[PDB]
Design a binder for these strands. Sequence first.
RNA 1: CCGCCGUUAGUUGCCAGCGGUUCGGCCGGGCACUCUAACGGGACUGCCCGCGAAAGCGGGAGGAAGGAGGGGACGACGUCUGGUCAGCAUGGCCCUUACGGCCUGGGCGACACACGUGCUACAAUGCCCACUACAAAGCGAUGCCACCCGGCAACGGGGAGCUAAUCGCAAAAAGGUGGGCCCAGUUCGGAUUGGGGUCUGCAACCCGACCCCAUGAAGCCGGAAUCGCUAGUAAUCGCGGAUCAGCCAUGC
Lengths: 99, 60, 127, 207, 155, 125, 79
Amino acid sequence: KIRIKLRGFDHKTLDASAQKIVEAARRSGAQVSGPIPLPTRVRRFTVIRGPFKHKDSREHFELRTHNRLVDIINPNRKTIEQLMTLDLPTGVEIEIKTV
Amino acid sequence: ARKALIEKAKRTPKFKVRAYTRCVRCGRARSVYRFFGLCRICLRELAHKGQLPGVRKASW
Amino acid sequence: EQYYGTGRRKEAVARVFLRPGNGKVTVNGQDFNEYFQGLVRAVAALEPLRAVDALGRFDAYITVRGGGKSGQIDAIKLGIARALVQYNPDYRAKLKPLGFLTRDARVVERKKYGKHKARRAPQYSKR
Amino acid sequence: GNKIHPIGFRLGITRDWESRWYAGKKQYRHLLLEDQRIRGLLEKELYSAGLARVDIERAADNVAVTVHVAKPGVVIGRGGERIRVLREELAKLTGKNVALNVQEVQNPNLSAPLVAQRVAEQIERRFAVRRAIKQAVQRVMESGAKGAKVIVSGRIGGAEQARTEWAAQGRVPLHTLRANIDYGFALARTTYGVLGVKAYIFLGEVI
Amino acid sequence: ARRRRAEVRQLQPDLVYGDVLVTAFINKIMRDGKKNLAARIFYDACKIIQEKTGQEPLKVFKQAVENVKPRMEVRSRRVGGANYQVPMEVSPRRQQSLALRWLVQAANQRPERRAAVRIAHELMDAAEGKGGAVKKKEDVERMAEANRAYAHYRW
Amino acid sequence: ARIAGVEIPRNKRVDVALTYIYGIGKARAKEALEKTGINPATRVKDLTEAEVVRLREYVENTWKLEGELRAEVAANIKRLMDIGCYRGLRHRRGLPVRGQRTRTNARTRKGPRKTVAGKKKAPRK
Amino acid sequence: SLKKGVFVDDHLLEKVLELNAKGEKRLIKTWSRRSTIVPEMVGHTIAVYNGKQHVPVYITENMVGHKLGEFAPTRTYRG
RNA sequence: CCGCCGUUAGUUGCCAGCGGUUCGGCCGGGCACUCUAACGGGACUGCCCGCGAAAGCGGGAGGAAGGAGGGGACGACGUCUGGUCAGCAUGGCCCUUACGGCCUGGGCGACACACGUGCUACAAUGCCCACUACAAAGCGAUGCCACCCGGCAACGGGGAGCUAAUCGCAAAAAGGUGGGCCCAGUUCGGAUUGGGGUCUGCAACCCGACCCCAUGAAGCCGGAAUCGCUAGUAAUCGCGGAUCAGCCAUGC
C-alpha cells in the first residue's frame, strides 16, 4: 500500500539510499519489495565545438536520470517513524505514493 | 543591438507569437535549449567548466 | 522433461521451450510455416536439429520477439542449439566446431556523427 | 591545441560537480537560473581570498549553500559579520533556505584554480610573466605535487603580438582516467587587453 | 592494401542444397539487401530450370560456369606512364568470380519481362555455348590471344 | 469513344481509357464506373454502346472538360493580368507563380537556360 | 489564411464608415498591406505604403476577398 | 557502449508451472524464463601441435568470444601571422538630440547564367490497391491525446487515460498472401497551374504548411570527369527528437 518511487541523479549514491531503506525498512518492519530498478532517462543532447561555423565537430551530452522503487506491506510504527524522519537525500528527491 | 535584445525578451510585448528564447548567461537566442534556457554554447562552456549536474559526457 | 534455450542475435529475444513429440514448431502463437514463410532462413532455424536430425522427437514450443524478423529466426537457431546443450551436452563438443554456439556481434554500429549511414560520409566539394 | 577541459575529462568518476540535486523537467531551468545567479554573486562579492568550489546540493526548497574557500580568518570578518549580510543577500534573492558553508583547502599549491588565481594575480600586479609563473610552478612542485603546468595566454607583457607562454614542470599525464587532476582558469588582464592563465595540478594515481 | 593480402572469406553453402556458389551467385543477384526476393526468384528460376530441361540444374550450372571461365585476362602492365595492356594467367578464383558476375549482368542486359525469365533463358544459352556473358568471356580469351605481344610484360 | 471533345482512347481498361483524357483522371473515372454501373475491369473496346451513351450523358451533363477549362484558364488569367494580382503579375513576367527562387531553379515555368558569359566572381583562391 | 472569416483591419472599416456617409476626399493611406481588398472598398484610390511610397491602386471590383499587398511588390525590375 | 553466463531484485514481463478466464497474461499466484542497474566472473600466445636466432608466423582445442573481438570519449610538442568584438569578453578608434531606443511594411525569398551540397525519378528484382507481422530509441500536463461522432478526404466537434517499463504519440516500412499495369513520356515520373477547405497564429498577397478534382510538362538512366564505401559495413528501408504557434526540414 505504501509504495515509494525514487527520483535520483547519480547511480552510486542511489543504492546507498535504497540499501539504507531496504535495511531499516525490513529491520523495523516486514516484507519490502526489493530494489526494483527503473530504466534511466538518458536524455539526448548534441552541440558543436566553437562559437563558430565549422558545422561538424560536435560533442554529444545527455541527462542521466536514475529512478527506482521501494514497496512495503506492513504498518509498523517504527518504519513510518525513522524512515520518514531519519533521512539524508542530498541529490535524491523521492516520490511517496499510497497505492 | 545587444543591450535591448535582453529587454525585449524580458518585458514581453503583446501577442503570443512575439516571444523568443535567450541564453541569459551569454545573451543569445539561436541554438538555445529551452530546457536549460542556455545556448548550446553556454551549455558547453559551463559543461566543460564542470558545473552542470544531471548531465555528463554522453558516451552511448 | 523440458529443454530451454536462450536464443539471441542482435536484440532479438527467443525463449526456447522444447518437449517430446513430432514438432509443434509454434512461435509467438502461430505455426512455424506461418510466422516465417517465403524465406529460406526459416529452414535454417530447423538446421540445429537437422545436423542432429532427431528433429521430429521434439514438440518445439518456442516464443520469439524483439529485434527483427530474420534476426528473430537466427536467435531461435542459437536457442535450439542451447536447449539440447542442456540435456545431452555431448552435442556441445561436436556443435562447437560446427559453430552453433557463437552468438552474434554483427551489431548495429552507432549512427556516427557526420555521416549518412554508419560508414558513409558526405561528398567532396572543393573543385 | 584541442586540450579538452580536464574537468570535462574527469566527469566519469574522476571529478565531482559544483551542483548536485534533482530537477523534474520544466523546473530544471529555473533552478539553474537562480543557482547560477547565486553562484556568480558568491563568486564576485566574496572571491577576495581564494575559492574554487561553487558547490551546492538541494531539493525541496532546501539549499546546501556550500563553498570551498581559502583563507577563512579576516574573511569571516570581525565575529561572523562578513558572512552575515552576504548570506543575507543570498537569503534575499534566494528566498528559500540558505545554509552557508565556508571551507578551506589547506594548501595554496593545491587545487589548480587557486594557484591559477595567484598567477593571474602576478601579472595583474604587472609582473614578469616567465619568471613569476615558473616560480609558482616550482612552488607547486615544492609543497608536494605530482604535476605542475600553468600557462599564460594573451598579449604577453607587451608589444602587439600575442601568444601563450611556457611554464611546465614535473609530469603532467592527462590522458589517464585515474590521475585526479585539478584544473583552473585564471582570467588574467592588462590595460591593453586580455591574458589567459590555465592551471593544471596532477594529484595522484588510483585513489 | 599495402599491408596484408586481404582474402575472400566465407559466404554461405546453399541454405537448401549444400554448396557455396549457389548462394554466392544469390549474393550477386541481391537487389540491395534483398537476399529475400533475389534468392526467392533465383530458386523460382531453378525449379523452372529443372522443369524445362530436366538435366541436373547444377550440371547446367557447372556448364555455364566453366563455359564462362577466363583462364587468361588482359590487364595493364607497369612501365610508369605507359600501360602496356598485358594479359595474365588469371587465378581461377577471380576466373569463377568474374564468371558468375558476367552471367548475372548478361542475363540482366536482356529486355524481357521478369527476372527468372532472363535468368533461365540466358543461363540456357550460356550453358550451351552462345550466351552473351559467354560472348564477353570468349572476347576476353580472344584478347589474351590478341595480346601475343604482351607475352613477357606480365605483373 | 467520342464522348467529350473528340476523346478516343480505345482498346484498354475503361479507367485508363478515361486516364488519357482531359477533365478525367482516375478519380472521376472510378466514379464514372460508379455512377454508370459499368465494370472497371472489362475493356473499353467491348464496351456496350448504350453504356457509353449514358456515360457521355454523365460526363457532359455534369461537369465540363478540355474546352471550358483552358479557355477559362486564359480568362481568369486575363484576371491574372486584369491589374496584375501579383501572382498573376509574375505570370505576366513569363515566370513561375509563387515567389520561390529564380536565382537558380525555375526549370519549368521558364524555358531552358539562356547562356551568359559568366561574368567572374570573387577570389576564393 | 483565415477559416471562419476574412481578415480585415478595423482601420479600413472605421475610416470607411467616416468618409462614406459624408462623401469626403479620395486617397486611402493605410500603413498596412495585410488587410483584405474585400468588396467593401468599391474601386477607390488605395495609396498603401508600398515600402517607400504609398502605391495608389484603382481597385476594380473583381478584386473581391483577395488581399491588399497583392498589388505592389516594391521589387523594382523583374524579367 | 556492445556481445556469454553469474547475484539480488520483481505493478514491465510471466502458465515456464497450476486454478479460473467477458476465456485477452485478463483474474489468482510465482520469479527461475524477458527485462531493467548497480555488483562481478570472463581472453592472458595462457594451453596443444609445427615453425624463426628473437619478434612472431601458421595450424588444434577449449571456448559467447581469439591472437588489436566492433565502438565512442580521450586527440601530445608544434604549424598555419587560420577564423571569430554577429556567443562572450576585453583593447584601441569613431559615432552621442544619433553608427542610439521604439513602430510600420519591403527585404536577408529578386533573376538573363554559375558551381556545391541533396532528395525525387527516368520504371517489370519493377510498382499501384489489399490483407497480416517483427524493430529499437525517444518524446508527451493547459502537453500527449486512445475512442465515439462528423466530411467521400484534408481535418473538425466531442471526449477516457499519464508528471509514465503501467496511458498516449504509433501507424514502422522493407516484407508475405491476394488483386492490376502488359515497355506505354505509360496507371511510370510527379513538375507546373487553375477551382475549393483545414489548422496555426494579431496577421499566411508579396512570405506558412496541409487536403480534394483537373492539369499530369521535363525526363527512355547522365561525355571530360570526380565522390563514397572493408562486413550487418555498401546498398536498400523506416522511426523519433533538437529549434519549434505554425512551418520553408530533401537538412540534423
